[PDB]
Chains A and B, each alone.
Chain A
Amino acid sequence: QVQLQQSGAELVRPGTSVKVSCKASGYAFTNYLIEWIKQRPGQGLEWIGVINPGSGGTNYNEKFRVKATLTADKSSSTAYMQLSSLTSDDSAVYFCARGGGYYWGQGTLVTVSAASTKGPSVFPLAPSGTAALGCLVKDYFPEPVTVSWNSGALTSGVHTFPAVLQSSGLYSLSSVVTVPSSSLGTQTYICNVNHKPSNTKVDKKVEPK
């Protein structure tokens, strides 16, 4: 079973450089090409370039010739993409893909910003034969926040909304769930909020008021 494991999300300052990695497993790394693709939020796919790990040879899209540098380390089965002189236009998800189009990495989110990391505040959206309840995750930076319910045991009827950018420059999101009204007195409902950039982990119990 083949896997292309990419490095984690990066929050990087304007004018600096960032280097993302793509680690191959389950196949002979040096026998296949590695391509890099850019996806801006809510936008399409753009091709950056390609490298042959078994020779060191590269080809770039002219739009990324100045900005990007593709390398590969045969010893650690890893491909790297370095982006220089970072701007907000570089904020995107970057994917590595093995030649042939079948095998893709999971993507690496890059946010280019001078703003500070900030953890969210989590507030209950208390319920009043179906009840709606939820959690409001307010004022965090950067993205992402993940939300689960009852430590992953509750998945049916959950909607976790895409975050919105507030006028303050901070993000906010809500996650809701509909459940049987008859369960409000017998079942504990907890939203598990995780904001990795600020190490925030909140497990908010949502009680009927």
Chain B
Amino acid sequence: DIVMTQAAPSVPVTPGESVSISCRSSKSLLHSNGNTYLFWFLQRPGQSPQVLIYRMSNLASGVPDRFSGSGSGTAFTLRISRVEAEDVGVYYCMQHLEYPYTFGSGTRLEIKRTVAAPSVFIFPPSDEQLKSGTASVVCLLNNFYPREAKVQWKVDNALQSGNSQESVTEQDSKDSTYSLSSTLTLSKADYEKHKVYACEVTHQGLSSPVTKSFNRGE
């Protein structure tokens, strides 16, 4: 088969600046008809892929003039000028010279915005859930940048381990931030043997870790 390689899994870009995304092939994609059979696709989170470039350098209908493609036959570049916050997504190359058609592994475009500390919120378990025998304590980290953020749980100021789970959103297409949730899961009986629940957040935008907490019963 023809192997398509995308050397960078992600590339950071400040809005307004230009960026280049590379792709390489293990065989020349040039056909004797003169065309080079390489596509560039964009895939936004939760959506189907969409074509940007066809036959290595042709802009697809409806794609902005800020996107362009070029290459040698074995090495290709998708160039985006004046990168917008809305350009977040994964960019893939694909060869269609020979069967089987093959794709590159994708390059995510990351928007480099100003560093922003998360807004931290803590939610105790609802009385509705406590009745069922389980307790979920949720810590929300809202609209922060960069993506990297550590969350530590403390119960009666004792550091927790093995009882939490996190989920992070895709980078926002408008404000270029991320949000994260951490959920601490205990049984109702164990939840009721403790008083103080806290989530402690470590992030590049914070000089020292931030703590949000509550006292059970308040």
Q: Which residues of A contact B (CB under 8 A)?
A: 35, 37, 44-47, 49-50, 59-63, 95, 97, 100-102, 104-107, 121, 123-126, 128, 130, 132, 134, 136, 138, 159, 161-164, 166, 172-174, 176, 178
| A59 B99 Cβ-Cβ under 8 A | yes
Q: A59-B99, A161-B168, A164-B165 are in contact. List 20 more A-B contacts (CB 8 A).
A: A44-B104, A45-B106, A47-B100, A62-B100, A63-B100, A95-B49, A102-B51, A104-B49, A107-B48, A124-B126, A134-B123, A136-B126, A136-B136, A136-B183, A138-B129, A161-B169, A161-B181, A172-B183, A174-B183, A176-B142
Complexed CA–CA distance, A134 and B138 (Å): 10
| A125 B167 Cβ-Cβ under 8 A | no
B39 / chain A contacts, CB cutoff of 8 Å: 101
Interface string of B97-125 (1 = CB under 8 A from A): 00111111110000000000001010101
| A173 B140 Cβ-Cβ under 8 A | no
B123 / chain A contacts, CB cutoff of 8 Å: 125-126, 134
B41 / chain A contacts, CB cutoff of 8 Å: 45, 101
Q: How many A-B residue pairs have CB under 8 A?
A: 113
| A44 B106 Cβ-Cβ under 8 A | yes
A-B contacts, 17 listed (Cβ < 8 Å): A45-B41, A45-B106, A47-B101, A59-B100, A97-B49, A101-B39, A101-B60, A102-B51, A121-B129, A124-B126, A126-B123, A134-B140, A136-B129, A136-B183, A161-B167, A161-B181, A163-B167
Q: Which residues of B contact A (CB under 8 A)?
A: 39, 41, 43, 48-51, 54, 60-61, 92, 94, 99-106, 119, 121, 123, 125-126, 128-129, 132, 136, 138, 140, 142, 165-169, 179, 181, 183, 185
| B103 A105 Cβ-Cβ under 8 A | no
Complexed CA–CA distance, A104 and B43 (Å): 12
A107 / chain B contacts, CB cutoff of 8 Å: 48
Secondary structure dominating the interface of A: strand
- Name the residue on A nearest B62 (C-beta): A102
| B181 A174 Cβ-Cβ under 8 A | yes
Q: Report, nearest first, the 3 A-B pairs whose CB atoms are least far apart.
A: A61-B100, A104-B48, A161-B167
- Name the residue on A nearest B61 (C-beta): A102
Complexed CA–CA distance, A61 and B48 (Å): 21
Complexed CA–CA distance, A176 and B179 (Å): 10
